[PDB]
From a paper:
The [name] MAGUK, commonly known as SAP-90 or [name], is very abundant in the [name] and, in rats, has also been found at axonal juxtaparanodes adjacent to nodes of Ranvier. Knock-down studies have shown that the [name] protein plays an important role in the integrity of synapses by anchoring receptors. The [name] domains of [name] are all class I [name] domains, in which the ligand is the C-terminus of the partner protein. The binding cleft for the peptide ligand lies between the βB-strand and the long αB-α-helix of each domain.
The crystal structures obtained are in the same tetragonal space group with a very similar unit cell. The [name] domain binding cleft is ordered, but the PDZ2 domain shows disorder in both the βA-βB loop and αA-helix regions. Weaker and more diffuse electron density is encountered for these segments, which is consistent with disorder around the PDZ2 peptide binding cleft, including the GLGF motif (GLGF). For PDZ2, the binding cleft is linked to the αA-helix through main-chain hydrogen bonds between Leu 170 O and Ala 200 (O-N distance of 2.9 Å) and Gly 171 and Ile 195 (O-N distance of 2.9 Å). The αB(PDZ2)-βD-βE([name]) and αA(PDZ2)-βB-βC([name]) can therefore form in the absence of ligands. The cofactor-reduced GSH (L-γ-glutamyl-L-cysteinyl-glycine) was used in all but the final protein purification step at a millimolar concentration (in the lysis buffer). The S-shaped electron density was fitted effectively with a single conformation of GSH with amide plane-aromatic stacking interaction with both F119 and Y147 (GSH). If GSH is present, the F118/Y147 side chains are in contact with the amide planes of GSH (GSH), and GSH moieties such as the thiol and carboxylate will be presented to the PDZ2 binding cleft. The thiol carboxylate and amide groups from GSH can then, in turn, participate in interactions with the PDZ2 cleft on formation of the αB(PDZ2)-βD-βE([name]) interface. It is likely, therefore, that GSH effectively modifies the surface of [name] such that an αB(PDZ2)-βD-βE([name]) interface is enhanced.
Numbering used by the authors: 58 to 246
The structure:
Amino acid sequence: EGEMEYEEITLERGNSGLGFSIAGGTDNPHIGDDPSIFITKIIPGGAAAQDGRLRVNDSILFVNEVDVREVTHSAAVEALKEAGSIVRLYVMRRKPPAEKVMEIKLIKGPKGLGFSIAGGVGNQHIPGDNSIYVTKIIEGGAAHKDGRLQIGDKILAVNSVGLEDVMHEDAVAALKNTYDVVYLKVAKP
Ligand SMILES: N[C@@H](CCC(=O)N[C@@H](CS)C(=O)NCC(=O)O)C(=O)O
């Protein structure tokens, strides 16, 4: 965590470009006196989002064979626009904070587990991430009464069924196909 890491990410240009916005350069450094080109936004439903590797705050070092470590903002946009259909990026990032994985046992109340979900493949809740997220916890519901499950939590598994890269519909189906006592694997940020 916090340690610098490097990654090769190749993207195929969609109808709406590569699906990310950038800032920085020697023109207007984004962090102090650091002239690096930074990802500021991952566009929902775009190429970078579907590929799920690129992250906000990644520094682009190379675009194909073009060195963008110390260039202007304009020279960066040009390099990306001119890179063709298949774009080879070499990036650097500080490793993100690790998440707490936790198994939670819930007994249904009169109205179920007491929480709602969003996310899924082709229905991303955060751009670049196919995970199933908790979006609402119902007042006085089972989850609320437990006190562990929170907004923004990830559901990784329902009993023995994993929810890694599944459709939203499949996540709802897994939660429905349960008995009264449900075991959930959850990730907390
Ligand atoms: N491990 C290889 C590949 C790592 C890599 O992707 N290198 C960067 C710069 S050190 C690069 O120029 N990649 C884009 C390219 O394929 O030319 C190397 O030593 O160059």
